[PDB]
PDB file of C-alpha atoms in Angstrom:
ATOM      1  CA  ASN A   1      60.071 105.243  49.848  1.00  0.00           C
ATOM      2  CA  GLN A   2      61.700 107.176  52.842  1.00  0.00           C
ATOM      3  CA  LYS A   3      59.781 109.054  55.514  1.00  0.00           C
ATOM      4  CA  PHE A   4      60.383 112.443  57.163  1.00  0.00           C
ATOM      5  CA  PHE A   5      59.343 114.153  60.218  1.00  0.00           C
ATOM      6  CA  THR A   6      58.635 118.035  59.669  1.00  0.00           C
ATOM      7  CA  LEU A   7      60.249 119.655  62.586  1.00  0.00           C
ATOM      8  CA  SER A   8      58.535 123.133  64.054  1.00  0.00           C
ATOM      9  CA  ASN A   9      60.966 124.850  61.881  1.00  0.00           C
ATOM     10  CA  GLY A  10      59.983 123.414  58.539  1.00  0.00           C
ATOM     11  CA  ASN A  11      62.774 121.291  58.148  1.00  0.00           C
ATOM     12  CA  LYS A  12      62.966 117.647  57.125  1.00  0.00           C
ATOM     13  CA  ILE A  13      64.470 115.064  59.147  1.00  0.00           C
ATOM     14  CA  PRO A  14      64.743 111.085  57.714  1.00  0.00           C
ATOM     15  CA  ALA A  15      62.253 109.704  60.398  1.00  0.00           C
ATOM     16  CA  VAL A  16      64.694 106.633  61.376  1.00  0.00           C
ATOM     17  CA  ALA A  17      68.389 106.853  62.155  1.00  0.00           C
ATOM     18  CA  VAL A  18      70.028 103.664  61.300  1.00  0.00           C
ATOM     19  CA  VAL A  19      73.962 104.482  61.925  1.00  0.00           C
ATOM     20  CA  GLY A  20      75.337 105.432  64.891  1.00  0.00           C
ATOM     21  CA  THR A  21      78.656 105.990  66.206  1.00  0.00           C
ATOM     22  CA  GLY A  22      77.967 105.442  69.875  1.00  0.00           C
ATOM     23  CA  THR A  23      79.162 101.803  69.565  1.00  0.00           C
ATOM     24  CA  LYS A  24      82.928 100.861  68.832  1.00  0.00           C
ATOM     25  CA  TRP A  25      84.831  97.729  68.134  1.00  0.00           C
ATOM     26  CA  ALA A  26      88.551  98.361  69.097  1.00  0.00           C
ATOM     27  CA  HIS A  27      91.104  95.729  70.244  1.00  0.00           C
ATOM     28  CA  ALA A  28      92.761  97.066  73.249  1.00  0.00           C
ATOM     29  CA  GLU A  29      92.982  97.716  76.810  1.00  0.00           C
ATOM     30  CA  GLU A  30      92.168 101.521  76.499  1.00  0.00           C
ATOM     31  CA  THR A  31      89.248 101.460  73.958  1.00  0.00           C
ATOM     32  CA  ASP A  32      88.782 105.346  74.375  1.00  0.00           C
ATOM     33  CA  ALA A  33      92.294 105.710  72.486  1.00  0.00           C
ATOM     34  CA  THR A  34      91.888 103.503  69.479  1.00  0.00           C
ATOM     35  CA  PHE A  35      90.518 104.332  66.303  1.00  0.00           C
ATOM     36  CA  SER A  36      88.051 101.770  65.216  1.00  0.00           C
ATOM     37  CA  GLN A  37      88.368 101.010  61.532  1.00  0.00           C
ATOM     38  CA  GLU A  38      85.569  98.405  61.944  1.00  0.00           C
ATOM     39  CA  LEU A  39      83.355 101.665  63.116  1.00  0.00           C
ATOM     40  CA  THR A  40      84.429 103.747  59.848  1.00  0.00           C
ATOM     41  CA  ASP A  41      83.928 100.641  57.501  1.00  0.00           C
ATOM     42  CA  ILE A  42      80.040 100.015  58.670  1.00  0.00           C
ATOM     43  CA  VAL A  43      79.636 103.561  58.741  1.00  0.00           C
ATOM     44  CA  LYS A  44      81.040 103.994  55.210  1.00  0.00           C
ATOM     45  CA  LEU A  45      79.127 100.954  53.855  1.00  0.00           C
ATOM     46  CA  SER A  46      75.870 102.387  55.298  1.00  0.00           C
ATOM     47  CA  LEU A  47      76.402 105.936  53.401  1.00  0.00           C
ATOM     48  CA  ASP A  48      77.482 103.800  50.082  1.00  0.00           C
ATOM     49  CA  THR A  49      74.892 101.390  50.122  1.00  0.00           C
ATOM     50  CA  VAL A  50      72.012 102.227  52.275  1.00  0.00           C
ATOM     51  CA  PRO A  51      69.133 104.003  49.954  1.00  0.00           C
ATOM     52  CA  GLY A  52      67.782 107.662  50.503  1.00  0.00           C
ATOM     53  CA  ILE A  53      69.025 110.256  52.836  1.00  0.00           C
ATOM     54  CA  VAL A  54      71.085 108.556  55.587  1.00  0.00           C
ATOM     55  CA  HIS A  55      70.598 109.649  59.229  1.00  0.00           C
ATOM     56  CA  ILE A  56      73.630 109.180  61.621  1.00  0.00           C
ATOM     57  CA  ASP A  57      73.513 109.713  64.892  1.00  0.00           C
ATOM     58  CA  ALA A  58      76.941 111.160  66.519  1.00  0.00           C
ATOM     59  CA  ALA A  59      77.871 112.595  69.660  1.00  0.00           C
ATOM     60  CA  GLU A  60      81.053 114.538  71.126  1.00  0.00           C
ATOM     61  CA  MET A  61      80.929 112.144  73.846  1.00  0.00           C
ATOM     62  CA  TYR A  62      81.082 109.148  71.933  1.00  0.00           C
ATOM     63  CA  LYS A  63      84.590 110.433  70.998  1.00  0.00           C
ATOM     64  CA  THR A  64      84.196 108.990  67.318  1.00  0.00           C
ATOM     65  CA  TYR A  65      84.215 111.874  65.137  1.00  0.00           C
ATOM     66  CA  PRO A  66      87.898 110.623  63.564  1.00  0.00           C
ATOM     67  CA  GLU A  67      86.262 107.449  62.394  1.00  0.00           C
ATOM     68  CA  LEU A  68      82.995 109.153  61.135  1.00  0.00           C
ATOM     69  CA  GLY A  69      85.220 111.669  59.680  1.00  0.00           C
ATOM     70  CA  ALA A  70      87.117 108.766  57.999  1.00  0.00           C
ATOM     71  CA  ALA A  71      83.776 107.463  56.702  1.00  0.00           C
ATOM     72  CA  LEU A  72      82.431 110.743  55.440  1.00  0.00           C
ATOM     73  CA  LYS A  73      85.752 111.471  53.207  1.00  0.00           C
ATOM     74  CA  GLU A  74      85.577 108.209  51.696  1.00  0.00           C
ATOM     75  CA  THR A  75      81.952 107.914  51.210  1.00  0.00           C
ATOM     76  CA  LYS A  76      80.854 108.487  47.450  1.00  0.00           C
ATOM     77  CA  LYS A  77      77.491 109.144  49.309  1.00  0.00           C
ATOM     78  CA  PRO A  78      77.147 113.185  48.279  1.00  0.00           C
ATOM     79  CA  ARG A  79      76.600 115.221  51.597  1.00  0.00           C
ATOM     80  CA  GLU A  80      73.037 116.435  50.961  1.00  0.00           C
ATOM     81  CA  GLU A  81      71.846 112.249  51.143  1.00  0.00           C
ATOM     82  CA  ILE A  82      73.271 112.454  54.944  1.00  0.00           C
ATOM     83  CA  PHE A  83      71.703 113.417  57.880  1.00  0.00           C
ATOM     84  CA  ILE A  84      73.866 114.155  60.749  1.00  0.00           C
ATOM     85  CA  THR A  85      73.195 114.954  64.076  1.00  0.00           C
ATOM     86  CA  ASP A  86      75.890 115.509  66.692  1.00  0.00           C
ATOM     87  CA  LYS A  87      75.651 116.403  70.385  1.00  0.00           C
ATOM     88  CA  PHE A  88      77.412 118.689  72.768  1.00  0.00           C
ATOM     89  CA  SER A  89      78.884 116.602  75.591  1.00  0.00           C
ATOM     90  CA  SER A  90      77.174 118.519  78.644  1.00  0.00           C
ATOM     91  CA  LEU A  91      77.329 115.500  81.017  1.00  0.00           C
ATOM     92  CA  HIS A  92      81.125 115.064  80.506  1.00  0.00           C
ATOM     93  CA  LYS A  93      82.681 118.010  79.539  1.00  0.00           C
ATOM     94  CA  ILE A  94      85.314 117.599  76.470  1.00  0.00           C
ATOM     95  CA  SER A  95      84.986 121.285  74.960  1.00  0.00           C
ATOM     96  CA  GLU A  96      84.225 124.544  76.817  1.00  0.00           C
ATOM     97  CA  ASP A  97      81.007 125.303  75.256  1.00  0.00           C
ATOM     98  CA  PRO A  98      78.790 124.041  72.322  1.00  0.00           C
ATOM     99  CA  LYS A  99      80.331 126.782  69.622  1.00  0.00           C
ATOM    100  CA  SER A 100      83.944 125.306  70.724  1.00  0.00           C
ATOM    101  CA  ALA A 101      82.586 121.787  70.518  1.00  0.00           C
ATOM    102  CA  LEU A 102      80.933 121.882  66.991  1.00  0.00           C
ATOM    103  CA  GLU A 103      83.967 123.872  65.674  1.00  0.00           C
ATOM    104  CA  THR A 104      86.152 120.925  66.730  1.00  0.00           C
ATOM    105  CA  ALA A 105      83.329 118.272  65.338  1.00  0.00           C
ATOM    106  CA  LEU A 106      83.409 119.926  62.047  1.00  0.00           C
ATOM    107  CA  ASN A 107      87.216 120.242  61.706  1.00  0.00           C
ATOM    108  CA  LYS A 108      87.511 116.489  62.273  1.00  0.00           C
ATOM    109  CA  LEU A 109      84.349 115.341  60.491  1.00  0.00           C
ATOM    110  CA  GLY A 110      85.378 117.533  57.399  1.00  0.00           C
ATOM    111  CA  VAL A 111      82.156 118.962  57.194  1.00  0.00           C
ATOM    112  CA  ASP A 112      80.526 122.793  57.308  1.00  0.00           C
ATOM    113  CA  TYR A 113      77.204 122.084  59.395  1.00  0.00           C
ATOM    114  CA  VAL A 114      75.690 119.425  60.772  1.00  0.00           C
ATOM    115  CA  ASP A 115      71.879 119.073  60.200  1.00  0.00           C
ATOM    116  CA  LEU A 116      70.699 118.840  64.004  1.00  0.00           C
ATOM    117  CA  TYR A 117      72.860 119.683  67.009  1.00  0.00           C
ATOM    118  CA  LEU A 118      71.455 118.373  70.757  1.00  0.00           C
ATOM    119  CA  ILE A 119      72.499 119.224  73.910  1.00  0.00           C
ATOM    120  CA  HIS A 120      73.305 115.808  75.090  1.00  0.00           C
ATOM    121  CA  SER A 121      72.226 116.227  78.670  1.00  0.00           C
ATOM    122  CA  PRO A 122      70.382 118.667  81.251  1.00  0.00           C
ATOM    123  CA  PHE A 123      72.914 117.618  84.092  1.00  0.00           C
ATOM    124  CA  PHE A 124      75.545 119.973  83.228  1.00  0.00           C
ATOM    125  CA  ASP A 125      78.959 118.931  84.042  1.00  0.00           C
ATOM    126  CA  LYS A 126      80.028 121.081  87.331  1.00  0.00           C
ATOM    127  CA  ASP A 127      83.243 121.690  85.389  1.00  0.00           C
ATOM    128  CA  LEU A 128      81.355 123.641  82.629  1.00  0.00           C
ATOM    129  CA  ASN A 129      81.824 127.308  82.883  1.00  0.00           C
ATOM    130  CA  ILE A 130      78.389 127.599  81.365  1.00  0.00           C
ATOM    131  CA  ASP A 131      74.491 126.844  82.304  1.00  0.00           C
ATOM    132  CA  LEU A 132      71.899 125.605  80.001  1.00  0.00           C
ATOM    133  CA  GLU A 133      70.494 129.141  79.226  1.00  0.00           C
ATOM    134  CA  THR A 134      73.748 130.218  77.823  1.00  0.00           C
ATOM    135  CA  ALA A 135      74.410 126.784  76.150  1.00  0.00           C
ATOM    136  CA  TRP A 136      71.124 127.288  74.363  1.00  0.00           C
ATOM    137  CA  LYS A 137      71.897 130.559  73.438  1.00  0.00           C
ATOM    138  CA  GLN A 138      75.176 129.239  71.619  1.00  0.00           C
ATOM    139  CA  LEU A 139      72.890 126.872  69.566  1.00  0.00           C
ATOM    140  CA  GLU A 140      70.644 129.514  68.775  1.00  0.00           C
ATOM    141  CA  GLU A 141      73.502 131.303  67.147  1.00  0.00           C
ATOM    142  CA  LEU A 142      74.946 127.935  65.574  1.00  0.00           C
ATOM    143  CA  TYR A 143      71.751 127.798  63.797  1.00  0.00           C
ATOM    144  CA  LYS A 144      71.312 131.342  62.966  1.00  0.00           C
ATOM    145  CA  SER A 145      74.901 130.932  60.998  1.00  0.00           C
ATOM    146  CA  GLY A 146      73.790 127.734  59.374  1.00  0.00           C
ATOM    147  CA  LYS A 147      76.193 125.578  61.265  1.00  0.00           C
ATOM    148  CA  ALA A 148      73.625 123.601  62.927  1.00  0.00           C
ATOM    149  CA  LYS A 149      70.733 123.477  60.384  1.00  0.00           C
ATOM    150  CA  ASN A 150      68.483 122.149  63.455  1.00  0.00           C
ATOM    151  CA  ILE A 151      68.655 122.640  67.300  1.00  0.00           C
ATOM    152  CA  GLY A 152      67.374 120.502  70.197  1.00  0.00           C
ATOM    153  CA  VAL A 153      68.499 118.355  73.320  1.00  0.00           C
ATOM    154  CA  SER A 154      68.345 115.164  74.676  1.00  0.00           C
ATOM    155  CA  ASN A 155      67.121 113.657  78.040  1.00  0.00           C
ATOM    156  CA  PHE A 156      65.524 116.781  79.097  1.00  0.00           C
ATOM    157  CA  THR A 157      62.362 116.375  81.511  1.00  0.00           C
ATOM    158  CA  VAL A 158      59.376 118.583  81.001  1.00  0.00           C
ATOM    159  CA  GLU A 159      61.243 121.169  83.646  1.00  0.00           C
ATOM    160  CA  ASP A 160      64.162 121.137  81.287  1.00  0.00           C
ATOM    161  CA  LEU A 161      62.466 121.967  78.333  1.00  0.00           C
ATOM    162  CA  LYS A 162      60.752 124.813  80.324  1.00  0.00           C
ATOM    163  CA  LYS A 163      63.675 126.357  81.418  1.00  0.00           C
ATOM    164  CA  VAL A 164      64.737 126.358  77.388  1.00  0.00           C
ATOM    165  CA  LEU A 165      61.341 127.340  76.151  1.00  0.00           C
ATOM    166  CA  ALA A 166      61.245 130.493  78.940  1.00  0.00           C
ATOM    167  CA  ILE A 167      64.591 131.772  77.347  1.00  0.00           C
ATOM    168  CA  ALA A 168      64.367 130.509  73.875  1.00  0.00           C
ATOM    169  CA  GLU A 169      64.327 132.581  70.574  1.00  0.00           C
ATOM    170  CA  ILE A 170      64.878 129.653  68.573  1.00  0.00           C
ATOM    171  CA  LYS A 171      62.138 126.716  69.796  1.00  0.00           C
ATOM    172  CA  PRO A 172      64.142 123.602  70.322  1.00  0.00           C
ATOM    173  CA  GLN A 173      63.100 121.117  67.370  1.00  0.00           C
ATOM    174  CA  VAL A 174      64.234 117.872  68.957  1.00  0.00           C
ATOM    175  CA  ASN A 175      64.299 116.174  72.581  1.00  0.00           C
ATOM    176  CA  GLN A 176      66.226 113.032  72.128  1.00  0.00           C
ATOM    177  CA  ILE A 177      64.800 110.554  74.718  1.00  0.00           C
ATOM    178  CA  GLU A 178      65.393 106.727  75.613  1.00  0.00           C
ATOM    179  CA  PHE A 179      61.926 105.638  74.606  1.00  0.00           C
ATOM    180  CA  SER A 180      60.830 101.970  73.768  1.00  0.00           C
ATOM    181  CA  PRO A 181      57.835  99.654  74.821  1.00  0.00           C
ATOM    182  CA  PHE A 182      59.443  99.325  78.111  1.00  0.00           C
ATOM    183  CA  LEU A 183      60.420 102.860  78.600  1.00  0.00           C
ATOM    184  CA  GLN A 184      57.345 104.916  77.159  1.00  0.00           C
ATOM    185  CA  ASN A 185      58.184 108.034  79.251  1.00  0.00           C
ATOM    186  CA  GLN A 186      62.126 108.545  80.073  1.00  0.00           C
ATOM    187  CA  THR A 187      61.057 110.966  82.701  1.00  0.00           C
ATOM    188  CA  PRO A 188      57.308 111.747  83.805  1.00  0.00           C
ATOM    189  CA  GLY A 189      55.138 113.226  81.083  1.00  0.00           C
ATOM    190  CA  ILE A 190      57.812 113.782  78.672  1.00  0.00           C
ATOM    191  CA  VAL A 191      56.390 112.301  75.551  1.00  0.00           C
ATOM    192  CA  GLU A 192      52.699 113.713  75.942  1.00  0.00           C
ATOM    193  CA  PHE A 193      54.643 117.343  76.889  1.00  0.00           C
ATOM    194  CA  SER A 194      56.858 117.011  73.926  1.00  0.00           C
ATOM    195  CA  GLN A 195      54.552 116.097  71.092  1.00  0.00           C
ATOM    196  CA  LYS A 196      52.064 118.861  72.442  1.00  0.00           C
ATOM    197  CA  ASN A 197      54.589 121.539  72.114  1.00  0.00           C
ATOM    198  CA  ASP A 198      55.737 120.360  68.647  1.00  0.00           C
ATOM    199  CA  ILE A 199      59.083 119.071  69.709  1.00  0.00           C
ATOM    200  CA  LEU A 200      59.943 116.166  67.846  1.00  0.00           C
ATOM    201  CA  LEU A 201      61.311 113.233  69.958  1.00  0.00           C
ATOM    202  CA  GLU A 202      63.619 110.927  68.699  1.00  0.00           C
ATOM    203  CA  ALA A 203      63.937 107.323  70.676  1.00  0.00           C
ATOM    204  CA  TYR A 204      67.538 106.032  71.301  1.00  0.00           C
ATOM    205  CA  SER A 205      67.816 102.480  72.257  1.00  0.00           C
ATOM    206  CA  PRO A 206      64.015 101.657  70.987  1.00  0.00           C
ATOM    207  CA  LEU A 207      65.161  97.769  70.556  1.00  0.00           C
ATOM    208  CA  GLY A 208      65.917  97.557  74.401  1.00  0.00           C
ATOM    209  CA  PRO A 209      63.531  94.529  74.868  1.00  0.00           C
ATOM    210  CA  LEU A 210      65.230  92.988  71.775  1.00  0.00           C
ATOM    211  CA  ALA A 211      68.788  93.380  73.345  1.00  0.00           C
ATOM    212  CA  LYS A 212      68.565  89.808  75.221  1.00  0.00           C
ATOM    213  CA  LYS A 213      64.787  88.334  74.776  1.00  0.00           C
ATOM    214  CA  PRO A 214      63.778  86.648  78.119  1.00  0.00           C
ATOM    215  CA  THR A 215      64.204  82.719  78.421  1.00  0.00           C
ATOM    216  CA  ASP A 216      60.159  82.361  78.801  1.00  0.00           C
ATOM    217  CA  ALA A 217      60.232  84.443  75.413  1.00  0.00           C
ATOM    218  CA  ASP A 218      56.947  83.167  73.476  1.00  0.00           C
ATOM    219  CA  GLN A 219      55.150  82.897  76.721  1.00  0.00           C
ATOM    220  CA  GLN A 220      55.284  86.618  77.088  1.00  0.00           C
ATOM    221  CA  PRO A 221      52.364  88.371  75.383  1.00  0.00           C
ATOM    222  CA  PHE A 222      54.465  91.371  74.380  1.00  0.00           C
ATOM    223  CA  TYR A 223      56.858  88.849  72.445  1.00  0.00           C
ATOM    224  CA  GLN A 224      54.002  86.500  71.096  1.00  0.00           C
ATOM    225  CA  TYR A 225      52.288  89.598  69.535  1.00  0.00           C
ATOM    226  CA  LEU A 226      55.343  90.934  68.021  1.00  0.00           C
ATOM    227  CA  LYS A 227      56.454  87.384  66.483  1.00  0.00           C
ATOM    228  CA  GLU A 228      52.808  87.581  65.140  1.00  0.00           C
ATOM    229  CA  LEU A 229      53.275  90.833  63.619  1.00  0.00           C
ATOM    230  CA  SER A 230      56.577  89.966  62.553  1.00  0.00           C
ATOM    231  CA  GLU A 231      55.201  86.905  60.425  1.00  0.00           C
ATOM    232  CA  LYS A 232      52.111  88.651  58.918  1.00  0.00           C
ATOM    233  CA  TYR A 233      54.272  91.607  57.499  1.00  0.00           C
ATOM    234  CA  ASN A 234      57.157  89.068  56.986  1.00  0.00           C
ATOM    235  CA  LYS A 235      59.761  91.636  58.462  1.00  0.00           C
ATOM    236  CA  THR A 236      62.044  91.054  61.297  1.00  0.00           C
ATOM    237  CA  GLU A 237      60.937  92.001  64.920  1.00  0.00           C
ATOM    238  CA  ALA A 238      63.276  94.885  65.154  1.00  0.00           C
ATOM    239  CA  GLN A 239      61.435  96.369  62.235  1.00  0.00           C
ATOM    240  CA  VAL A 240      58.204  96.400  63.528  1.00  0.00           C
ATOM    241  CA  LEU A 241      59.176  97.943  66.630  1.00  0.00           C
ATOM    242  CA  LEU A 242      61.286 100.510  64.907  1.00  0.00           C
ATOM    243  CA  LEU A 243      58.191 101.253  63.061  1.00  0.00           C
ATOM    244  CA  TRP A 244      55.793 101.171  66.132  1.00  0.00           C
ATOM    245  CA  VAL A 245      58.371 104.138  67.534  1.00  0.00           C
ATOM    246  CA  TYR A 246      57.419 105.602  64.224  1.00  0.00           C
ATOM    247  CA  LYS A 247      53.796 105.223  64.410  1.00  0.00           C
ATOM    248  CA  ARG A 248      54.036 107.097  67.799  1.00  0.00           C
ATOM    249  CA  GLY A 249      55.243 109.878  66.227  1.00  0.00           C
ATOM    250  CA  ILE A 250      58.541 109.581  67.347  1.00  0.00           C
ATOM    251  CA  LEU A 251      61.891 109.310  65.449  1.00  0.00           C
ATOM    252  CA  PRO A 252      63.775 106.007  66.281  1.00  0.00           C
ATOM    253  CA  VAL A 253      67.588 106.130  66.320  1.00  0.00           C
ATOM    254  CA  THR A 254      69.118 102.392  66.350  1.00  0.00           C
ATOM    255  CA  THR A 255      72.489 101.216  65.222  1.00  0.00           C
ATOM    256  CA  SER A 256      73.781  97.867  64.378  1.00  0.00           C
ATOM    257  CA  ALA A 257      77.236  96.278  63.411  1.00  0.00           C
ATOM    258  CA  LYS A 258      75.728  94.217  60.529  1.00  0.00           C
ATOM    259  CA  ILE A 259      74.674  96.088  57.277  1.00  0.00           C
ATOM    260  CA  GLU A 260      71.707  93.923  57.027  1.00  0.00           C
ATOM    261  CA  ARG A 261      70.041  95.083  60.118  1.00  0.00           C
ATOM    262  CA  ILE A 262      70.656  98.782  59.277  1.00  0.00           C
ATOM    263  CA  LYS A 263      69.317  98.245  55.697  1.00  0.00           C
ATOM    264  CA  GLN A 264      66.234  96.860  57.341  1.00  0.00           C
ATOM    265  CA  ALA A 265      66.059  99.476  59.714  1.00  0.00           C
ATOM    266  CA  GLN A 266      66.088 101.987  56.556  1.00  0.00           C
ATOM    267  CA  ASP A 267      63.227 100.395  54.973  1.00  0.00           C
ATOM    268  CA  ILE A 268      60.537 100.008  57.819  1.00  0.00           C
ATOM    269  CA  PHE A 269      58.572 102.264  55.597  1.00  0.00           C
ATOM    270  CA  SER A 270      57.970  99.372  53.408  1.00  0.00           C
ATOM    271  CA  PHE A 271      55.220  98.285  55.501  1.00  0.00           C
ATOM    272  CA  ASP A 272      52.911 100.174  57.718  1.00  0.00           C
ATOM    273  CA  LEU A 273      50.941  99.309  61.249  1.00  0.00           C
ATOM    274  CA  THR A 274      47.218  99.485  61.852  1.00  0.00           C
ATOM    275  CA  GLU A 275      46.161 101.925  64.485  1.00  0.00           C
ATOM    276  CA  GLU A 276      44.963  98.742  66.618  1.00  0.00           C
ATOM    277  CA  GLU A 277      48.472  97.035  65.997  1.00  0.00           C
ATOM    278  CA  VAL A 278      50.313 100.102  67.611  1.00  0.00           C
ATOM    279  CA  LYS A 279      47.820 100.627  70.391  1.00  0.00           C
ATOM    280  CA  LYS A 280      48.633  96.853  71.347  1.00  0.00           C
ATOM    281  CA  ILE A 281      52.385  96.899  70.927  1.00  0.00           C
ATOM    282  CA  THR A 282      51.845 100.084  73.153  1.00  0.00           C
ATOM    283  CA  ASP A 283      49.481  98.315  75.674  1.00  0.00           C
ATOM    284  CA  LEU A 284      51.286  94.973  75.874  1.00  0.00           C
ATOM    285  CA  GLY A 285      54.957  97.073  76.421  1.00  0.00           C
ATOM    286  CA  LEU A 286      53.292  99.241  79.101  1.00  0.00           C
ATOM    287  CA  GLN A 287      52.607  96.020  81.107  1.00  0.00           C
ATOM    288  CA  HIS A 288      56.429  95.200  81.239  1.00  0.00           C
ATOM    289  CA  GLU A 289      58.274  97.076  84.160  1.00  0.00           C
ATOM    290  CA  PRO A 290      60.549  99.835  83.311  1.00  0.00           C
ATOM    291  CA  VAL A 291      63.859  98.637  81.299  1.00  0.00           C
ATOM    292  CA  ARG A 292      66.242 101.825  81.511  1.00  0.00           C
ATOM    293  CA  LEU A 293      69.900 101.349  79.915  1.00  0.00           C
ATOM    294  CA  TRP A 294      70.603 105.199  79.708  1.00  0.00           C
ATOM    295  CA  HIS A 295      71.073 108.242  82.208  1.00  0.00           C
ATOM    296  CA  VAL A 296      70.693 105.367  84.925  1.00  0.00           C
ATOM    297  CA  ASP A 297      71.766 107.162  87.865  1.00  0.00           C
ATOM    298  CA  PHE A 298      69.570 110.464  87.241  1.00  0.00           C
ATOM    299  CA  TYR A 299      66.542 109.187  86.081  1.00  0.00           C
ATOM    300  CA  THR A 300      65.831 105.862  88.023  1.00  0.00           C
ATOM    301  CA  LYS A 301      64.021 107.681  90.362  1.00  0.00           C
ATOM    302  CA  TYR A 302      61.567 108.276  87.760  1.00  0.00           C
ATOM    303  CA  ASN A 303      60.946 104.743  86.843  1.00  0.00           C
ATOM    304  CA  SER A 304      57.660 104.108  88.605  1.00  0.00           C
ATOM    305  CA  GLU A 305      56.181 107.007  85.924  1.00  0.00           C
ATOM    306  CA  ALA A 306      58.319 105.642  82.910  1.00  0.00           C
ATOM    307  CA  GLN A 307      55.723 102.519  82.203  1.00  0.00           C
ATOM    308  CA  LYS A 308      52.278 104.634  83.070  1.00  0.00           C
TER     309      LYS A 308
END
């Protein structure tokens, strides 16, 4: 049975996002230009077949609205069984401001609102004629007008959150960060700070440790224990890790090309980790050095604090 997080505003969000539109298969030189049928297909198949409320992770920056649009139009999934996260591209300017970006997203997506709208990065493009304060106020209006049912940020440091909390009429509900066993603090003290201020974390690329397991794999305690738990529960290693993210009070955001893994992702609440299994994953993960796949140029300097 599906599990949800309760945001600070009372709204429910599916506790795993199993469908992402960040990753494309397009057979061309300029992949930025080419529609990916194989992406609309995997998304539409997800929507059609994945049980319960299906949480999609989109962003302006992915430039895959048409693909997601095509699948949304063609799906027999009704709109209220889809949870659509979308992200204003603040790092690489595509639209002037959040309101223009969301307007353009709704047009292309064929929907009237998104269920969550995030400011994608605190490092505002120098070409944007808006700063974070103004950016947030726009999201506050989109929220009020119901075009964004929930609002938050992504890749924000404690500092970035304070700037926003300092001017916030509507408290940001979500901070989407890179989080996994091998990067347990994207930026110094973010997890503890976010959870103490009732800001829900999502974890992007939580499956990093399983991206390409090391050569000396089942010598490494992290990988031995993870394997151990996969057999105990008769689940995939991925499912264990996704569930661990959840058990940490964080909403894991994952994607696959393979409908099996997506369905497995949705089905992580077919099982449960004990307190000590979670602590041990946490612990054995923390012995690993930081593995950061995202906002690398900005946050590499924070690596010394990521695996505390």
